[PDB]
Amino acid sequence: FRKMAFPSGKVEGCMVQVTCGTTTLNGLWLDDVVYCPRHVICTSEDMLNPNYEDLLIRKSNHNFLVQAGNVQLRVIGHSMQNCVLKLKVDTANPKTPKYKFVRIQPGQTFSVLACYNGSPSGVYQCAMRPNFTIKGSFLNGSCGSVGFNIDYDCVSFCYMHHMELPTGVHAGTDLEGNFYGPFVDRQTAQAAGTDTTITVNVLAWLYAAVINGDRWFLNRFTTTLNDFNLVAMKYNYEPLTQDHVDILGPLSAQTGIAVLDMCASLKELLQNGMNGRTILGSALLEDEFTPFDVVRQC
Amino acid sequence: SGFRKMAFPSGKVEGCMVQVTCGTTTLNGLWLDDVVYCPRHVICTSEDMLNPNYEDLLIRKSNHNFLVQAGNVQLRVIGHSMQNCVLKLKVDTANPKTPKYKFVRIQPGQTFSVLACYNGSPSGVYQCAMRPNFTIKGSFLNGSCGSVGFNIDYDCVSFCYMHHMELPTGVHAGTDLEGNFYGPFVDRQTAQAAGTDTTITVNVLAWLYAAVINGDRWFLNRFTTTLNDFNLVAMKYNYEPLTQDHVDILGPLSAQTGIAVLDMCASLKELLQNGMNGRTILGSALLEDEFTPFDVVRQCS
Numbered sequence A: 001f002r003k004m005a006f007p008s009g010k011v012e013g014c015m016v017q018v019t020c021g022t023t024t025l026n027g028l029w030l031d032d033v034v035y036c037p038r039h040v041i042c043t044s045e046d047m048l049n050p051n052y053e054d055l056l057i058r059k060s061n062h063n064f065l066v067q068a069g070n071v072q073l074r075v076i077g078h079s080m081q082n083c084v085l086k087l088k089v090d091t092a093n094p095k096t097p098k099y100k101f102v103r104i105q106p107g108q109t110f111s112v113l114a115c116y117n118g119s120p121s122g123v124y125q126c127a128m129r130p131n132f133t134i135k136g137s138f139l140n141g142s143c144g145s146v147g148f149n150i151d152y153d154c155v156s157f158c159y160m161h162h163m164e165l166p167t168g169v170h171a172g173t174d175l176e177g178n179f180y181g182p183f184v185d186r187q188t189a190q191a192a193g194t195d196t197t198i199t200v201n202v203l204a205w206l207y208a209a210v211i212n213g214d215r216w217f218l219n220r221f222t223t224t225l226n227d228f229n230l231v232a233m234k235y236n237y238e239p240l241t242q243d244h245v246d247i248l249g250p251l252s253a254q255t256g257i258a259v260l261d262m263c264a265s266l267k268e269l270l271q272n273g274m275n276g277r278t279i280l281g282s283a284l285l286e287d288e289f290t291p292f293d294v295v296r297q298c
Numbered sequence B: 001s002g003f004r005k006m007a008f009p010s011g012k013v014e015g016c017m018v019q020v021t022c023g024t025t026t027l028n029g030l031w032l033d034d035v036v037y038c039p040r041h042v043i044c045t046s047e048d049m050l051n052p053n054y055e056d057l058l059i060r061k062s063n064h065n066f067l068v069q070a071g072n073v074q075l076r077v078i079g080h081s082m083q084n085c086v087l088k089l090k091v092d093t094a095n096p097k098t099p100k101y102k103f104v105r106i107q108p109g110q111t112f113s114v115l116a117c118y119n120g121s122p123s124g125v126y127q128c129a130m131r132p133n134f135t136i137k138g139s140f141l142n143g144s145c146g147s148v149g150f151n152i153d154y155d156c157v158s159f160c161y162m163h164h165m166e167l168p169t170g171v172h173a174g175t176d177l178e179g180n181f182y183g184p185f186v187d188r189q190t191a192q193a194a195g196t197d198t199t200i201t202v203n204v205l206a207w208l209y210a211a212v213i214n215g216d217r218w219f220l221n222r223f224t225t226t227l228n229d230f231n232l233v234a235m236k237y238n239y240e241p242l243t244q245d246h247v248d249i250l251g252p253l254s255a256q257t258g259i260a261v262l263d264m265c266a267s268l269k270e271l272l273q274n275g276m277n278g279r280t281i282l283g284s285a286l287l288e289d290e291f292t293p294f295d296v297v298r299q300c301s
């Protein structure tokens, strides 16, 4: 049982290169508009306390070089929505998929299409951490790479990449340009809030381990939801809600293991550890598979 | 650790996926130029499957017996042949989305992206490592056969795997795009055991190089080893012996860190013989073996 990303082709067809001065990053080209991080308009000096409204009014359309492959797209208009720049271009992208912009909740997962110079380079699954960071793989030039889910033929864009933190984790916005978390697009070392573990996802992954034939961690003990949550909070796990328990119904039915029985197994793991044993190859409790993620793979 | 399995973007492969049906049996095919490639067991019924005579089954087939579809759109078959365990269906339309491509046969330890597909429609993409026993640990369900594995270098797609079967232990086996199985396996509905698997030594060494690159280098020592001496110890710990090709593909990381391959092998030999003694490498007490030297450079640089 492994992380599976959505097929990325519908997003690849939207990626372009956006350049301003000596800064180059990626843009997302949908219909006749290119979306990208606004910090592309900052110089080395600006980046420490950039007054974006002032920096933007001093820009003209021809300051923005947009390239789709070896084709320049002429910028005929520009505006800013929160931390994203929207460049109107003279050419519509015929590869534009059916799409929407969604703001994801902490604990939800999405696929990242990492891009450099407008060229897609890798795809992988991420979760929105409870502290609103993501543990991405992003290098210099990755900004403007997007995260997404696919439902039927519709692409739900939920993330655009802006920055790395001192700890090596990453932060960004939705496609309306609002950051996830308390972060700011200035060139400063920024710490996140204390992260917690996504409990409903650990439970989904334990169920996956069961479906795969792994059951050493199960027990006959039981727990109430409240008592489980007391232990969870003690170990910096997120609360489990009744909606989470409901969400885990299908996996419970399939394995014949009551949700609260799986909670008791997890409680024992938190308290006793894994004793060197492993679950699905991991020495650690994995929390970036959602219940939906497990089902889609069974 | 800072590392994760990263697949290649799948779009160039998505544009090549079709479905191939014989009767009520549908699996996936790969449409490149005017040829569709798919597992030959599409032509087997559930009565042929225990031991098909593929040569005889194919004689009874005609072009008009194959239903090839891109989505709901039928692609007319104008020729058919068999190459080892793959069927090649010549069609009357060259795929306009054909990328630059080659067919490569990979070695154990090498990683590749799989585009898992059902009824010609992609479901997901993930990275797999070819184990030393010539199996992969995929997520492959009924209908997944004909899904392919690939790597992408500079817009060229190197196709290396086409899916055919699941073994009793839940792991997966298949062919290259010339239809030759990886490993001793055969496309029959029989129980086939893989060899006992071993740890991918070359990828563990890549992992140790990655740790060094990131400043985590407590395990480095002042000694070296010969390749033979290392391989003899490695086999005692169920590690794969190193080949010359393995030494060669560690070259870039050895140059980047200035640590000779054989010196890193001596460090690994000490870890094997003495264990970790309660220490971690890149955050883990476990040595990772599914990142290749190329994967490391791709995620570090």
Ligand SMILES: *[C@@H](O)[C@H](C[C@@H]1CCNC1=O)NC(=O)[C@H](CC(C)C)NC(=O)OC[C@@H]1CCC(=O)N1CCC1CCCCC1
Binding pocket: A025, A039, A042, A047, A138, A139, A140, A141, A142, A143, A144, A162, A163, A164, A165, A166, A170, A184, A185, A186, A187, A188, A189, A190
């Ligand atoms: C895309 O433009 C770029 C993506 C980054 C680069 C490295 N990995 C990524 O994900 N993002 C940026 O360049 C950011 C631009 C800001 C928001 C104006 N900055 C950024 O990501 O900075 C990361 C660095 C490295 C770790 C760190 O703390 N930090 C913040 C700035 C740093 C603080 C210490 C003094 C020098 C500047």
Ligand SMILES: *[C@@H](O)[C@H](C[C@@H]1CCNC1=O)NC(=O)[C@H](CC(C)C)NC(=O)OC[C@@H]1CCC(=O)N1CCC1CCCCC1
Binding pocket: B027, B041, B044, B049, B140, B141, B142, B143, B144, B145, B146, B164, B165, B166, B167, B168, B169, B172, B186, B187, B188, B189, B190, B191, B192
């Ligand atoms: C694609 O057509 C299909 C992919 C399979 C389905 C389930 N997961 C997969 O990866 N492949 C097949 O159906 C194979 C067709 C043969 C090669 C003609 N067969 C196959 O994968 O068989 C799987 C079964 C289940 C476990 C097992 O060992 N095995 C082998 C066959 C047989 C089953 C009955 C018990 C003895 C072994």
Ligand SMILES: [Ca+2]
Binding pocket: B084
């Ligand atoms: Ca042959």
